[PDB]
Amino acid sequence: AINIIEYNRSYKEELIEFILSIQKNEFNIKIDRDDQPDLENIEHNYLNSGGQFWLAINNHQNIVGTIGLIRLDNNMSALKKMFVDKGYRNLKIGKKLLDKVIMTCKEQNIDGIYLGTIDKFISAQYFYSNNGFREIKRGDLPSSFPKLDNRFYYRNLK
C-alpha cells in the first residue's frame, strides 16, 4: 500500500498543503505558510545541507506522510515536519518513516536525534516515547539546535 521516497521538487506544493491542512485544520495550530520558509526550499534546507526529507506515498504516489532531518554540529541531528495522514495513522507509517531516518543516520555517522514539538500534538508525544525518545529539558538542548515548541526529546543511536 505504501512506499517511502526521497522528496523531489515536484512535490513542493502538495507537501506544503499537506502539512498546513494538518497543522491548521486538524490541530488548530496558529501557524501558516510564511512561518515555515524551510518548506519553500526543501532541497536546499534539508537535502543539500546533509539532512534528509522522506515522503510516504500511496499507490497514486500522493503524500500520506512526511519526515525531515537536519544535521547539527557534533554529529547530532534534529527531526522536523513529521506528519501522517489521519486516514493512514494505524498502518505503522510513522514507524516506517522513522526507521528510514534511523537507518540513514547510521550510514551517515549521526549519533542521535533531537526534536522539539508542541503539546497540541498529543498522539505524537506517545509515539516518540514509544519509539526510543526520552524527554529532555530546554536547558539540555545543544547550542546548534534551533529553538522554536514546548516539549523536547532525544533518541540515542550510538
Site for Ca ion, rule CB under 5 A: 32, 34-35
Shortest separation between residue 20's beta carbon and Ca ion, angstroms: 11
Calculate Rg over the CA atoms of the chain: 15
**How is residue 135 written as a grid cell?**
524527554
Residues 76 and 114 sit within 8 Å (Cβ to Cβ): yes
* Choice between 2 and 31, CB closer to Ca ion: 31
What secondary structure letter does DSSP report for 30? S
Determine the Cα–Cα distance for residues 91 and 18; give it in Å rounded to an integer: 18
* Choice between 20 and 84, CB closer to Ca ion: 20
Shortest separation between residue 115's beta carbon and Ca ion, angstroms: 22
Shortest separation between residue 106's beta carbon and Ca ion, angstroms: 37
- The candidate with the shortest Cα–Cα distance to 5, out of 76, 83, 100, 86, is 100
| Number of neighbouring beta carbons within 10 Å of residue 7 | 20
* Choice between 35 and 135, CB closer to Ca ion: 35
Shortest separation between residue 45's beta carbon and Ca ion, angstroms: 18
Query: Cβ neighbours of residue 140 under 8 Å, at least 6 residues apart?
Result: 152, 154
* Choice between 17 and 35, CB closer to Ca ion: 35
